[PDB]
Every structure is written in structure tokens, then in C-alpha cells.
Symmetry: D2
Subunit: 265 residues, 4 copies
């Protein structure tokens, strides 16, 4: 009886289904797949990418950038929700193929630099090519690209370094406060008395309150389903989107249910 | 007119004045200099070092370890208060010369890995040889060596990764709850509206409350003067030591004064 | 049509088939699998591991170490042939679970730290958890553990950082010069005019000459088949082993054939 | 008697004396100080910087770049001769303040990432802010920016990762093959039987032959004096410059003399 083969990180096909760029606001586009968010924000001073999805999405992202008039040298900055393989997967390759630099908090930078290995909950089960951050950000710090101001809001829980990114774009000339809020799930996590994350519950509870209070005319999430987006629905892709308040409340109710089930288990 | 020469990080002589090991508790010793703490905790399962002081202290620390019966292979773990040159200075060299592995939180690990460069407040003015952490710890996580349990208590402010380490040793057979609380100073820092540390004030205030509540029969600090230790006073070195409550209260009063002076400046 | 799923690095079952420790010399043991070498050298001053095989082999290696009387704290040093997933796979996890430090040359250290990603020939197709080296070695440098002297002999080609490690053990009291020579294969490589490795051919040719001249009473290789070892053959496992001269000559003949086939292709 | 203060890395004033850009060829400029080379190559596709000199030179380099019409975003690539503090000093800060990415060989990348600490010959005596390489290059590999092709020629000795960079620019319309050859000095080095660099002598001898054979209409060196440049001499700054052949021969004669003196010492 040999040791088991390594198991590839396989996902639902919709997570890997390419889509053409979908406009969210005047200068903000969804350029990932049907079920994984990768946001391109285009400024006169270069482009920002928030998340890249899975490791195998790099070429697709570059194709969609080209379709939008963003060449590899024009990509200046990569920001991340959190450093798991299904959101930061292609960052190392993107850095090699573009001018982009990565800004992230210390927790996300440490996890990215180990390619998602030694995860607090997944171990080495879900890894990806490691990448280095070029700039470390603190909670509430802003990064400004072409007069678009991105604010980091730490919302630890799903990962220690989970971050919501907020900025203001326009839509029909009017300002739109966009909130890219990270995942608030705890998939298979041990929540209570976890020796690798002793204050997990307290961090999640603080993160629900953080998300509830974000400036949030439009909420987007790394898994669009979490905020009720349907990237395949065209002109109605965002019609059913949740508010940040509703997203936080739904995540807290689910979390409270998981806590109760863990106590019973 | 040439550019200025690089300026060495020079310190008061007492900070560099070697001392013989000073016993703090049954298995805990001060082995640094007169004015910089470096704590050696000896267990049947190897030795732990908390801080090393300045970069040039490595050989002295190794001498004091040998005097205590700790060879290079017996040093198993290095913990840090914070990753500035006067506390983590010799860690890289210690790792090369001993069996020791470094455990630190993500913020301290990132700063250590850049040798203290790009400091939020000091820039590149105070650097030291970079070192890599071998284990990343979360707030409240414990590390157990030979039945001595070290608990990390994050107290961000002086640096983002500032940590208090607590453990229980014995003294005349009775348990002694030791608290190695990090610095609570803000030397020359811009406190209000600091773009590199937007929530600095909130973090300091939370850290005062954290220090005030630590299990703390005996408080030690990286600069012994901060907790009223006098490592040169022999059998009375710890006689005047502050409680954790008094240390936090003194640090908060000083901080409030600095805030008021900054507003006036 | 979605993007392809990630493909796991799957291997022949014999590569993953655990075996009990097989004694090579008085203090040198094969403790990996039937078809992947992982050498444990036991000294009074701690144990050295040369290679670990595939990522999923860590627990098996630790079991075999325990069977040999080597606890996790007794493992002092990990050396590598080259930093591909089937030889350095479990190094990150071994470092987390033992006292071991990694010594490697700069090329191997860079590849290990990126977990085998951005490989000159494999791209990101064959990755593993990244690890950091604790000591960088130069060509011909020696590392001495308990009076066993390990000499590094660089033999670039299969990877830039490919290394042969030599040491002298005993067998029936007599000295035995052991040569752990790295792979000399070029599996699917573009050999001529490779922009990522312009001097590939020259390096391979120099490496054949290096291997031919190693001190080599007993040759071992990361894939035992390359040196005609059969780890499942018990008391005759090493009976058919090649000399270093024969191994180099066979590798050069195969390489010359591949060159000719590449020219024709 | 306290431990000694840290000693700053101080240098001759001419090494820190700013100069205005000095044109070497149509698109190649010396933009460092009077006695430290920092070469700016301007292409329609961005600028390349080869070396930056001392750590405190970053702002001066950026000023000279601006004077040349190169903004921070236009700097695309930093190449290095070798990763000592007087040549790679300001690279970390340049990466933070510009769009530049660093390409270097593995040896130079490892030394840069430790900020010059644990030097084979200097120990920790000469350190600088650590930086990460974005691309690793192999011997003979080319990097092309705006149709300027830079070729790496490894010339190990002064450091393991010492590199000569060659490219072709124009001067009065005619092609000029420029050779930026690294230092061939061994200042205070133990040459024979050095355990940290066993093949030092062989590497230096191979490097003399490499430099002698470089394409070399114009030779430049990190210390301009080594190639008989006088950056303060205006229109005659390069008039007395050595050929690559003469530079190698002078370095070999000096090296042979040092070998003989070491034997006598
Ligand atoms: C297990 C999911 C996956 C993992 C993760 O990011 O933790 C990844 C390692 O596989 N991404 C998820 C995340 O929350 O970031 C978790 S939760 C899962 C993702 N979407 C599934 C269906 N719900 S939804 N809201 O998108 O319609 C639930
Ligand atoms: C400027 C001091 C120094 C610096 C630091 O750690 O920030 C170091 C970069 O120089 N270490 C300090 C610390 O708090 O950790 C600061 S505060 C300074 C240290 N001890 C001085 C005298 N007070 S005491 N309490 O020790 O008697 C004040
Ligand atoms: C493609 C093989 C594998 C790869 C490698 O190390 O390059 C790994 C990424 O899959 N390990 C090999 C090595 O040489 O190190 C190559 S060669 C292959 C290994 N053993 C196979 C059968 N020959 S043998 N000599 O062992 O009987 C050939
Ligand atoms: C000791 C010098 C210095 C050191 C170095 O790069 O090794 C640095 C750590 O201080 N830079 C040098 C180099 O070669 O790269 C060495 S040699 C020294 C530099 N220029 C001095 C005068 N000779 S010259 N040829 O420039 O007129 C000799
Ligand atoms: Cl481009
Ligand atoms: Cl020892
Ligand atoms: Cl153990
Ligand atoms: Cl700019
Ligand atoms: Zn996730
Ligand atoms: Zn996810
Ligand atoms: Zn400090
Ligand atoms: Zn201090
Ligand atoms: Zn291989
Ligand atoms: Zn292999
Ligand atoms: Zn040098
Ligand atoms: Zn120099």
C-alpha cells in the first residue's frame, strides 16, 4: 500500500469558466471567471487588479486586460482580499509577466510568500506559487493610483490577513462607493479553542461589524455568490446584490449556526 | 558638498555593558547587558531566549549561555518583544551559530526579515542583519518548551508586532507568573493622522489595557528602566520593579502628554 | 469550455511505496521509499538527512527516523541533491516538525524558496511547499557533523543547483567513500539554445566529468534505478550498483543521444 | 569596558560627491557620484539602472533620472555588478519609490536579500537594506529592454554572484559595445584554502579570462578608477579608459602579487 498521490485543488467548473470583461462602474471591471472575482480598476496612471482567482487564470486575465486597453506594463498594483489559492493563485506569474507590484498586510504577505502552505486550517492541502509583497499596508492605510483612493479595512477571520478594499468610482457621473469585502466563511474550520487561532471567534465578530459599517453603495465579494452577484446575468448581474449590512448579517447567522453545530459535534 | 556619511546606530554605554547572568527565577536569567534585557529560560528540553539586545551582543550572549550550561545546540527557540535593532539585533547571527529557531507574529517576522529597514517611524535609520522566522504565532497562541508554557499577547503600538510574553516559573518553590511586556514608548513618533499607521492611537490604548491585565507577579521589560529594574543592583535588582498595572498607567500618562505636545507642535 | 483543472504531480506507485530502513553503511541508511532515496546519516552529534523525496513522505520519514533512534530534535541538518518536488518535497514540513536546518547552494536555495515554481523547464507544473535555507554553501565547502565530513560538489545541469554530496562512513570497520550523486537526466528539456539556460550543454559536460572523478567506493542516486540500486532486494540491494564512472558515462551517452534527437526534431 | 559601538560604513568623500549626468553613449549615462558608477540606459520602453552606489544615494539618483526625463514609473529594471553596500546600497529604497524590478543571478539575489550580511569575507561589517530580486538570471542570459539587449556574463570572485553586463549602444551613429565589468579586487580576502570559498582562486582566474574576452569597445567599472575613468574630467572623462584586456591583465597581476604576499604572511 503506497502513500496517497497528491490531490490537485479542483474546483467547480464555473469557477474556471472564462468571461469577457463585465463593467461594474465607469472604471471598474470584473475580468475573472463566472464564479471568481478579479477586479480591474483603470486609471490614467495605470491599472489596479484586486484578486486574480485561480493559478491557471493568469493568461485569461492578461487577455481581458488587453481587451480593456491595459498592457502588461500598464498594470501597476495588485491588491488581495486574502491569500488563498482561489484568489491569489496567479499573483506570482502576474508579477513575472507584468509591471505589477503587490501591496498587502503582513499576514497576507506571509501567507502569500509561502504559497498558501502551512495554512491555519488547510495545512498544505491548498497551495499555489509563492509571491513576495512589495509594500506592506496597515489597517486603514490608503493607496492612491490616478486619484482613485483605495482604503484597506482589516477583517481577520477567514484568514488572519483578510482585508476589505474600498474606493469610490463613478457610474452615470455620480459617485459610487464600492466595497470589495472579503469572505466571511469558515469552511470546515475549528472555531472554538483552536490552538493555531485562539481569538478566531472574537476576530470574526469584529469583522462582521467592520463589514456592516463599510462605505458601501455597491458590495462585491471574492465569490460573487456570497453577495448575490451573478456575473453571467449581463445587464442584471448586480441587480440582486446584497448590501454590506445584509452580507455581514447573513455571514454572522451562518457563523452562529456553525458554532452551535461544532458544540454539538 | 558630498552626501552625508552613514551614521552608525550608537547607544548609551550601559546598553553595551556586559553583565554576568542574573537570576530572575528558578529557571529564568537575565543574560544581556546592564541596560538591555535578554532572558534565558532553561528547561530540561532546551533553552529559550527572549530578545538578544544589540547586534554586537551575540558572542556575549553565547558566553553567558555557556556559563549557564547551555551549549549552542541546546538553544531551541528565540522569542522577541519587538524587531528593532536594540532587541533583535543579534538574531540572525544567533541562528547561524546555534540550533535556535525563531517564533514571531507576522508583523514582527516581516520587520525582522527586512532587518528593521523601512521602519514605519525610523525609515532606514536603525537597521540590523535580517533574519527569517521559522514559526508564525497568532495572538494568544502558546508555545511549550519542557513544560514551560509561553503565551503571546499582542500589544501593537511601539511596533505593529509588539508582543508581551508570559510564562510561569518558580521561585523558592512557589509559582511566579512572569510578564515580559514590550515597550510602550513612542520615541519621536507622529501619533495623530500617521499615514503609515492610521490606527496607532487606538492600538496603543488597547495595548495599555492588555498590559494592565497580564498575569504579572513579576514584570520585566526590554529596557529594564521602563519597569524600574536595575540589573546592576545585585540582590535588589528587582526590588523596585513596577507592577504591570503601574507600568501601563505610567506609559499611558506619558503617551497622553505626548499627544498633547504633538497637538501643540 | 472552462480552463483546465490543476493537475496533481502524480508518480509511479513504487515512488510512494514505504520501506523500512535499509542499511547502506555503518551509519548511513536509506529511509525513503522503494524508488526515492532519502538518506539518514546518524552521528553522535545528531542526524543528517539527504533528501526527503515527495511532499507526502514527511510522516513516513519521521517514523523511520524514530525506528532508528532519531527523534525530531535529533535531526540537525537537511542536505539536498536538487530542489525538485520528488526530492525536496517534504523539507518545509520537516523543518516545522524537527530541529533541522537546511544547507544548500544559492541556486538550490532560490528554487526551494519558491517551492519549485518558475522552474527553468517545468514552469509551475511541479511545485511543492516552499522552504528557506539556513546556510548557503559554496562549491567544495564542507559541513562536519559528529566527525562525518560532507563535501559539496556542484554538478549543475539537471537543475542549476544540482549537487553531489560525498562523505566517508565505515562498513565492516573499513572506510567507505560514499558518493550521493545528483540526477544527470534532462527530462523533456530543450538542451540547445535555451534562453533560460544558455550554457546548459557546457554545464552538463562539466558535470559528467565531476561525477566521473568523485571519491566513490559506493554510488547512490536520488532515483536508485539511475545507479542500479534495488532498494527492495534486501541484502543484494546494492550488489549491481554502478560505479560513478559508469553512471557518468551512461548519462553522457544518453545525453548525446538526446542532443542528436533534438537536432532532428 | 562596554562592547564596541557599531561602526558605520564610511567611505572617501569622492564616493559620496554628487555629479550631474555624464553622457557615456547616445543612451547611456553615468548618474551616480564622482567615484561610484550608477549607469542609466534610456530606451523608448523605459529606463534601466545598472548599480546605484551607496545606500544614501537614492534621492540623488532619482534627481538625476528626473533631469534626464525619467520619472519613477519609467524606471523598469535594476541590474547589479555585485551586491555590496557601495554598489547595491539604495536598491531596496529605489524599488519602493519607483516601478523598478531587480534582475540578478542566484548568488547576487541571496546576498541582496540578506542586505550584505554574512558576507563570505566581511561578515556583518558592511550591510545595507535588504531587497528581493524579481527575476533570476543564468549565465549568458539576455534581457531586452526597448531593443537594448543586456547580456549577463558571470565573473565570480569578488563576490560569488559578480557579473559583467554587456550591451550595444551608439555614439555618433556608430555601434559601441559597452562592457560594465565587475570588480576584480579581493580586498583583505583570504585567497588560499578559504573554507567559505574553496575554489576562490580558480574562479578569479576564470573571471580574468572572461573579462579579457568580453565585447568591449568601451569598458566601465563600478569604481571608475579601476578602468581609468575620471568622471570629473568632463569631455575627457573616458579618454584614458583601459580596454577590457588591460583591466583583466592589471587585475591578474595584482591578484598574483596578493597571492604571493599571503603565502609570505
Ligand atoms: C471552501 C471555499 C473556498 C476556499 C477558501 O477560499 O477558503 C478554497 C481554499 O477552496 N472559497 C471560499 C471562500 O469563502 O473564500 C470557501 S466558501 C465556498 C465558496 N463559494 C461556495 C458557495 N457559496 S456562494 N456564496 O459562493 O454561492 C461556498
Ligand atoms: C528610542 C529608544 C530605543 C529605540 C526603540 O526600541 O524604539 C531604538 C531604535 O533606539 N529603545 C526604546 C524602547 O522603548 O524600546 C526607545 S525609548 C528609550 C529607551 N530607554 C530610555 C530611557 N528610559 S528607561 N525607561 O529605560 O529608563 C528611553
Ligand atoms: C522526470 C523524472 C523526475 C522529475 C525530476 O526530478 O526532474 C520530477 C519533476 O518528476 N525525476 C527525475 C530525475 O532524474 O531526478 C526525472 S528522470 C526519470 C526518473 N527515474 C525514471 C526511470 N529511470 S531509473 N534510472 O530511475 O530507472 C526516469
Ligand atoms: C574595499 C573596496 C570596496 C568594497 C567592495 O566593494 O568590496 C566595499 C565593501 O568597501 N569597493 C571595492 C571594489 O573593488 O568593488 C574594494 S577595492 C577599492 C575600491 N577603489 C579603491 C581604489 N582603487 S581605484 N581602482 O578605484 O582607483 C580600491
Ligand atoms: Cl507591456
Ligand atoms: Cl553545541
Ligand atoms: Cl524530539
Ligand atoms: Cl512616476
Ligand atoms: Zn479562502
Ligand atoms: Zn475562496
Ligand atoms: Zn523599539
Ligand atoms: Zn528599544
Ligand atoms: Zn529533478
Ligand atoms: Zn527526480
Ligand atoms: Zn564589492
Ligand atoms: Zn566596491
Amino acid at each position: 500500500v503506497p502513500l496517497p498521490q497528491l490531490r490537485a485543488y479542483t474546483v467547480d467548473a464555473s469557477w474556471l469558466q472564462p468571461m469577457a470583461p463585465l463593467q461594474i462602474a465607469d472604471h471598474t471591471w470584473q475580468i475573472g471567471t463566472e464564479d471568481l472575482t478579479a477586479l480591474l480598476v483603470q486609471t490614467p496612471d495605470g491599472a489596479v487588479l484586486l484578486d486574480g482567482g485561480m493559478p491557471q487564470m493568469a493568461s485569461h486575465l492578461l487577455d481581458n486586460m488587453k481587451a480593456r486597453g491595459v498592457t502588461p506594463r500598464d498594470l501597476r498594483l495588485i491588491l488581495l482580499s486574502h491569500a488563498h489559492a482561489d484568489h491569489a493563485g496567479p499573483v506570482a506569474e502576474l508579477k513575472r509577466r507584468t509591471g505589477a507590484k503587490v501591496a498587502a498586510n503582513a499576514e497576507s504577505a506571509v501567507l502569500l510568500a509561502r504559497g498558501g502552505s502551512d495554512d491555519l486550517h488547510f495545512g498544505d492541502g491548498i497551495t499555489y506559487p509563492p509571491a513576495n509583497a512589495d509594500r506592506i499596508v496597515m489597517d486603514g492605510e490608503v493607496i492612491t493610483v490616478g486619484g482613485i483612493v483605495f482604503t484597506a479595512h482589516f477583517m481577520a477571520g477567514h484568514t488572519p490577513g483578510s482585508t476589505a478594499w474600498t474606493w469610490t468610482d463613478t457610474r452615470n457621473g455620480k459617485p459610487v462607493r464600492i466595497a470589495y469585502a472579503d469572505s466571511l466563511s469558515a469552511p470546515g474550520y475549528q472555531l472554538q479553542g483552536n490552538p493555531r487561532y485562539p481569538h478566531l471567534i472574537e476576530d470574526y465578530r469584529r469583522s462582521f461589524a467592520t463589514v456592516r459599517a463599510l462605505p458601501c453603495d455597491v458590495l462585491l465579494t471574492p465569490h460573487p455568490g456570497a453577495s448575490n452577484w451573478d456575473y453571467a446575468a449581463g445587464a442584471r448581474a448586480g441587480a440582486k446584490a446584497l448590501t454590506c449590512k445584509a452580507y455581514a448579517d447573513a455571514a454572522e447567522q451562518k457563523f452562529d449556526g456553525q458554532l452551535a453545530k461544532e458544540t454539538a459535534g
